[PDB]
Amino acid sequence: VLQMISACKGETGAMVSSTLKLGISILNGGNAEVQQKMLDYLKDKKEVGFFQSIQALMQTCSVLDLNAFERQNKAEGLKVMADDEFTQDLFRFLQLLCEGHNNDFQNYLRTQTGNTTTINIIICTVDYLLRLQESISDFYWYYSGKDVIEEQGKRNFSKAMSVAKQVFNSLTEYIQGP
Amino acid sequence: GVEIETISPGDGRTFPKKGQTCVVHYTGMLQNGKKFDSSRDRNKPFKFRIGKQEVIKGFEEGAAQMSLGQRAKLTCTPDVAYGATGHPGVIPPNATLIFDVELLNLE
Amino acid sequence: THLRVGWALTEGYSPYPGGGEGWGGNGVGDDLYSYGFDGLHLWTGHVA
Amino acid sequence: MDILELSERLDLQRFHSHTLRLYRAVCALGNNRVAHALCSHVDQAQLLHALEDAHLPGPLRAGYYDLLISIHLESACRSRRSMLSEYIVPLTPETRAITLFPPARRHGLPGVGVTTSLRPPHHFSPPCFVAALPAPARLSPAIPLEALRDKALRMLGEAVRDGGQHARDPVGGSVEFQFVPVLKLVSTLLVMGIFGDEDVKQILKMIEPEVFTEEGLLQMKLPESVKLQMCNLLEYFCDQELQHRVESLAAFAERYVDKLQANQRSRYALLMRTARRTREFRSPPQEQINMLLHFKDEADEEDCPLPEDIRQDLQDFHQDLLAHCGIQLKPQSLQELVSHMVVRWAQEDYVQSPELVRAMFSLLHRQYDGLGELLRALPRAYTISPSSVEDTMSLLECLGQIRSLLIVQMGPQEENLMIQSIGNIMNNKVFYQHPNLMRALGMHETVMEVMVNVLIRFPKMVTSCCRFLCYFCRISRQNQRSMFDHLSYLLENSGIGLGMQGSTPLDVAAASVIDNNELALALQEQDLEKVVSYLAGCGLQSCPMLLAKGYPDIGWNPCGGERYLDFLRFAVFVNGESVEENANVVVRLLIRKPECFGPALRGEGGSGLLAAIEEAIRISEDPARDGPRVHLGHAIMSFYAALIDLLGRCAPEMHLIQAGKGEALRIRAILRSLVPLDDLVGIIS
Amino acid sequence: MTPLYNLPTHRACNMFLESYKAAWILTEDHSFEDRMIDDLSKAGEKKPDPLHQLVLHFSRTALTEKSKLDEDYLYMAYADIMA
Amino acid sequence: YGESLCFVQHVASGLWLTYAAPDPKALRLGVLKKKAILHQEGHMDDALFLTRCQQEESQAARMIHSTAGLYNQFIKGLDSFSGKPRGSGPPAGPALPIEAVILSLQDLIGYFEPPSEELQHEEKQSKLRSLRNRQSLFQEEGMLSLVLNCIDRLNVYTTAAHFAEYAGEEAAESWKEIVNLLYELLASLIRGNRANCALFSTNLDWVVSKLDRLEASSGILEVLYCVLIESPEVLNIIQENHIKSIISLLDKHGRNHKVLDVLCSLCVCNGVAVRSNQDLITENLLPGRE
Amino acid sequence: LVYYEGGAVCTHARSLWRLEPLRISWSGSHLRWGQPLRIRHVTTGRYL
Numbered sequence A: 001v002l003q004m005i006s007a008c009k010g011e012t013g014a015m016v017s018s019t020l021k022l023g024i025s026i027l028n029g030g031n032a033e034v035q036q037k038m039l040d041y042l043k044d045k046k047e048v049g050f051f052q053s054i055q056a057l058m059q060t061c062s063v064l065d066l067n068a069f070e071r072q073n074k075a076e077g078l079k080v081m082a083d084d085e086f087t088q089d090l091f092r093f094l095q096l097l098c099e100g101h102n103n104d105f106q107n108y109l110r111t112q113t114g115n116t117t118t119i120n121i122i123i124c125t126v127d128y129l130l131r132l133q134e135s136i137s138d139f140y141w142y143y144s145g146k147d148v149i150e151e152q153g154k155r156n157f158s159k160a161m162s163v164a165k166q167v168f169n170s171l172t173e174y175i176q177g178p
Numbered sequence B: 001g002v003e004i005e006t007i008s009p010g011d012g013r014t015f016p017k018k019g020q021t022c023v024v025h026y027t028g029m030l031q032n033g034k035k036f037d038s039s040r041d042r043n044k045p046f047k048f049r050i051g052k053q054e055v056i057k058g059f060e061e062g063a064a065q066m067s068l069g070q071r072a073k074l075t076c077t078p079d080v081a082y083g084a085t086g087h088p089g090v091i092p093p094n095a096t097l098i099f100d101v102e103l104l105n106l107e
Numbered sequence C: 001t002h003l004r005v006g007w008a009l010t011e012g013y014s015p016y017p018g019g020g021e022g023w024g025g026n027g028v029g030d031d032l033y034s035y036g037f038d039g040l041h042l043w044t045g046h047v048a
Numbered sequence D: 001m002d003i004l005e006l007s008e009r010l011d012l013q014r015f016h017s018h019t020l021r022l023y024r025a026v027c028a029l030g031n032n033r034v035a036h037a038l039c040s041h042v043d044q045a046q047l048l049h050a051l052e053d054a055h056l057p058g059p060l061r062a063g064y065y066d067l068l069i070s071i072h073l074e075s076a077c078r079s080r081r082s083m084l085s086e087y088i089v090p091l092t093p094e095t096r097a098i099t100l101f102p103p104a105r106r107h108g109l110p111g112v113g114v115t116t117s118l119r120p121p122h123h124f125s126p127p128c129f130v131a132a133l134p135a136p137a138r139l140s141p142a143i144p145l146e147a148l149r150d151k152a153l154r155m156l157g158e159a160v161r162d163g164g165q166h167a168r169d170p171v172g173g174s175v176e177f178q179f180v181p182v183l184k185l186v187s188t189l190l191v192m193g194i195f196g197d198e199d200v201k202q203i204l205k206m207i208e209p210e211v212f213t214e215e216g217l218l219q220m221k222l223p224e225s226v227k228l229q230m231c232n233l234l235e236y237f238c239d240q241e242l243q244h245r246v247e248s249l250a251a252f253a254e255r256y257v258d259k260l261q262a263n264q265r266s267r268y269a270l271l272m273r274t275a276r277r278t279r280e281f282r283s284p285p286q287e288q289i290n291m292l293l294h295f296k297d298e299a300d301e302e303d304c305p306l307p308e309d310i311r312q313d314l315q316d317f318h319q320d321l322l323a324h325c326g327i328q329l330k331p332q333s334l335q336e337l338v339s340h341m342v343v344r345w346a347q348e349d350y351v352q353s354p355e356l357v358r359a360m361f362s363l364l365h366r367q368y369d370g371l372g373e374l375l376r377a378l379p380r381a382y383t384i385s386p387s388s389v390e391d392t393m394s395l396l397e398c399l400g401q402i403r404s405l406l407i408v409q410m411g412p413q414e415e416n417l418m419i420q421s422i423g424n425i426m427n428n429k430v431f432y433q434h435p436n437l438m439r440a441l442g443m444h445e446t447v448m449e450v451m452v453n454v455l456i457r458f459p460k461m462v463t464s465c466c467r468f469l470c471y472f473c474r475i476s477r478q479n480q481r482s483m484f485d486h487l488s489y490l491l492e493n494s495g496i497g498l499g500m501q502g503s504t505p506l507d508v509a510a511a512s513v514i515d516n517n518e519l520a521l522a523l524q525e526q527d528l529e530k531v532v533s534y535l536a537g538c539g540l541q542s543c544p545m546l547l548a549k550g551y552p553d554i555g556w557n558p559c560g561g562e563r564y565l566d567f568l569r570f571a572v573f574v575n576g577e578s579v580e581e582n583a584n585v586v587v588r589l590l591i592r593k594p595e596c597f598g599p600a601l602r603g604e605g606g607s608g609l610l611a612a613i614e615e616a617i618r619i620s621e622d623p624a625r626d627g628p629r630v631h632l633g634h635a636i637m638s639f640y641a642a643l644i645d646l647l648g649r650c651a652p653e654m655h656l657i658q659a660g661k662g663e664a665l666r667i668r669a670i671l672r673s674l675v676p677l678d679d680l681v682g683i684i685s
Numbered sequence E: 001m002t003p004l005y006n007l008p009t010h011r012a013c014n015m016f017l018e019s020y021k022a023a024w025i026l027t028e029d030h031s032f033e034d035r036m037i038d039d040l041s042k043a044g045e046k047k048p049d050p051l052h053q054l055v056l057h058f059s060r061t062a063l064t065e066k067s068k069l070d071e072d073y074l075y076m077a078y079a080d081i082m083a
Numbered sequence F: 001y002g003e004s005l006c007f008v009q010h011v012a013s014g015l016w017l018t019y020a021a022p023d024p025k026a027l028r029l030g031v032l033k034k035k036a037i038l039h040q041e042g043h044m045d046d047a048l049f050l051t052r053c054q055q056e057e058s059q060a061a062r063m064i065h066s067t068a069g070l071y072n073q074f075i076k077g078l079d080s081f082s083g084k085p086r087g088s089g090p091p092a093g094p095a096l097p098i099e100a101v102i103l104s105l106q107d108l109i110g111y112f113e114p115p116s117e118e119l120q121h122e123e124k125q126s127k128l129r130s131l132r133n134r135q136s137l138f139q140e141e142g143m144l145s146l147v148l149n150c151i152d153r154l155n156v157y158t159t160a161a162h163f164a165e166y167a168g169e170e171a172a173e174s175w176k177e178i179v180n181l182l183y184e185l186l187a188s189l190i191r192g193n194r195a196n197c198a199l200f201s202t203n204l205d206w207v208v209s210k211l212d213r214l215e216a217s218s219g220i221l222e223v224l225y226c227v228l229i230e231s232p233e234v235l236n237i238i239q240e241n242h243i244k245s246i247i248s249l250l251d252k253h254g255r256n257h258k259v260l261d262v263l264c265s266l267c268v269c270n271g272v273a274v275r276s277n278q279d280l281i282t283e284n285l286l287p288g289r290e
Numbered sequence G: 001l002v003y004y005e006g007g008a009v010c011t012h013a014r015s016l017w018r019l020e021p022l023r024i025s026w027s028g029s030h031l032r033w034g035q036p037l038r039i040r041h042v043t044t045g046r047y048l
């Protein structure tokens, strides 16, 4: 799983999606042996592709967009967040690494010692959260004046809130222990 | 301008006529004795018709002078077979061809 | 088919089955020790 | 000397083996003229003798087998294989007689029985080196096929029979050299469809006598190469089983549709002697058939107007189809045999060849998952009335011919062949009557692949391809969307090299979005900024082509400007109406780069439009300023006209102005500020 | 809006195939993953067992030095099965 | 590293390091390069980051420096006596650094050799990445041009005696050895790298014209084989005279299977065939039968 | 001359530099703010 994620080189597709699904499935329930094996392998190889690919994947994630929504409404008169499940899977995978109060992985995610360069994942997570928050604020500003809401607005609100709820859980997992 | 030499005698009475098809078994080779074609390897006689320009002039003129069942040898000059172009990958330019033709049946 | 007749010398005329001069299948008159005839040519030294 | 003496002269052996490799290389990938030429250097008798010979060294044995295959069979096998993933089933009496099982029951033998899917025949010509020389393409050299297949079967049988003697002098010096060549030959012959029912029965018998009956190969000890060949052999029978399933399904579909139509006729006739029951007959046929099949579960058995016997018939067919795919509802079937063999091979030893591993696991996955393959293959299935068989076959020939040229560097002969084939295709009625079938074969993807491969160096190839693609788009909206999918890919190419004389990729890109509100709305904004960036260059540097021809140099190239402006116009205006979103985006992008407006509107030091056009008119008088087939004044006057037309089309509608929209008013004010009224009046006058 | 009983036979057949695939084929359920992993995890008669060999093969393909990762359906199918 | 922002100042003058304002003329021309200068105030964006570099790149840089110096010295020494026959007396110029050049070439050849075909797959993949990186590093600084110039200057002599007529018999014993080592090093630099191979698409005559030289024939053949088997760009440039020169090689040097391999490489590359090459080879090789 | 550039030159040898503190002893000491030192170009061996 780690090798495939490193090989993807931060390009979205079906391969990385299936790899993340397999990782989630094998890592459920905070399995300690899997966490230990992954950490040992990562520290042994000292390769920087893994975190570079993860950073690129996070930067490629999508958020709400009003222009697409208006275009779709115009067209139906005669998508937006089309890859939410991929984002949820990515952040769930990141969460499952630290579950169980694993101090070693919690520290490793912030700084890599032996590696030539280092990448901080907490900063990336907060950046994505900020982008999502701005999108939600724009949506509410658009909808404030009118009173009622149709089906599409409710669906978009529900899915954006689900993604936000996953990101908050991941941030909580990064901290506890403490 | 074609030289013809006899190898075996034929009937001496039947000759090719307009509107007929000649069936022959032939073996071709260059002037240096390097074989390049032979219908007997494929075990299938070759059929051609006179006047429709299906084969080189040398072959047609050589066959027109042969009797049924006769075996003879033919020699064709470069200007009568392929000229200065030749057959790419088979015959080089300006090559003299020698044939061993036997007439089997006429129809 | 191949068929020839003629004379040959006690020394030198030693045809071995298989390959030899030019393309194999050598008979009577394919070297400078034998002299053959086959109805149309005189063979000697592998030349007709 | 005897060729068998090469078993002790190693240097000559190596040189001759490499000579055979060179022969096999100079005729690779469909070069039939060289294949014809090579027949004078290696004739039939030599090849057959080498095939039979038992004292030949291994390398030469393999070289001669490969040489025979390359000269005589490679092209036909490739062509046949390219068309083996599609199923065009004609409706004929023999089609109606196909059933999943013989009179759920015991499985039939794979590969035997009648098939009806269309596959074009093979073409060969006899070699001859006395025919008079005279540009039609050449066919492959011919060779008798029944005798060859009999020879191959006899040789394989002899090898299998003698394998049990565990002798110390195998043919070729090893088991691999004894077995691999004949297996390659038999596989090539089998894929081409040369064998009959009895021959395939013999092959199956000698693969595993116990399973296929009404010591085999699998029960022997083999190296990796023989195992790879066996995998290649088994793939063929798996494919045959899949094809049989598809054909049976099509036959049942026809038989069922007949009864459904009859029943609907009777019901409608009866109805004329609640009102909700009349909604069936005022809905599109797709919805009717969709609702007629909603009785899979008893809970969904309320809205079906049908009787019980018809539902029982469909249920019986469905159960039989499930049984055929191995879904339960001393192996005695192909699936069990394959699974056991693969698992046993895997757990007997640690295999080293990656190709063998991939083959084994692909086979295993195909076996375990039965109907996934049927689901993936159904999209490429189609039915045809018997009257269209000739036209369909003619179209398939040309399509295969085009596909063949996807693996060769372009040349004049290839250009002519493609032009001729496209011309032939566009004149067929099936190209119009069955657009879905054409879209299912992916012809447009092949055409674009060929177009890009040469992307000028071939100006006649691009024009024809562009014309064909535009015509394809014009047929229907589904084709329009299909080509719209590749809009970004099309735009990346033809960004500096116009090849202006004839239709280019930008033309098909424009044609892919004409008069379609949905597609225009779905247009991405990344395609808009890239085109504007391309335009910006045209306003800075002259065209090198004109300079090469001696034209005077000026700091811009109007031709590309007008081309891109035409594309933008087609993008912004649809059927007499302006889409405001793209209008706002494009006007914003344009104002962001004032240099795109051309020298007149540059601003600082920029003269007005009237002065520029007057200067162009005066230029048109002087040959020195107009040239050393194209003129400069007209080009300038066309560029400015296109720009003004685009800007005019970008303006908003009047009903929006009545609502007092801020954006509409801002846009109108900007446009009004850009062009003075008196300038327009002067131009018109 | 024409009645279904007036269309040509072949068009009706194509529509029927589409509908049957949409409604009756993919709705079917069939679980084989557990059995397929159980079968692959056994051994006869230490060298790797078949599942280990499959995983090693995919690792080998991943580790090869290349500019881009090619998409292959076999890996996706087997990853889905294992998951 | 990567966190401490820093400003650079000149101690004597106190000026700060910053970048000059962009030039519209240069910007319109596409000159991204921004000249750097020292200014009294500069701007607020003059901070710089510090990034670590591996040991291999530093070692390669030092080797580049040393070898460039040595080979420039050698080239100048060779040019010293370009057209000055020594007659019966001493040769011209200071002596040549023969031993240093030989040792340097031997060291570099062993620095580029490829991984063993008996290593485990993953360690071998690691071996191939580092080698490609080092080849690119060396190529980017102009070492290929340097070795090409050296070969060109040495190639103007037909034999060892003709060389000794100018450089003296004392240094003519290493002529053939140096030529062979240079060809071997060029082959090592080119092997297995698409980008480096693609460079030869403009001067293929430079390679083909040397195939008939009696010294280092095998090295030149190896260079040609390495170039042909990698770059599809060259395959579209071949002409009939090149084919005839190669076929000239088999009727002049004897029956060698390497030439047949080279010819096989001219027909199909990466599953794409070139009809012109196949036709030319068939026309010029088969019909004679000698 | 000296320039600012981006792209592939970030991975090339012509963008690397070595720090040479003026003092010879303990030249490997941790760098500290305000320290005077020289700058060298590795490939060309010239000093800024």
Ligand SMILES: [Ca+2]
Residues within 6 Å of the ligand: A100, A173, A176
């Ligand atoms: Ca927790």
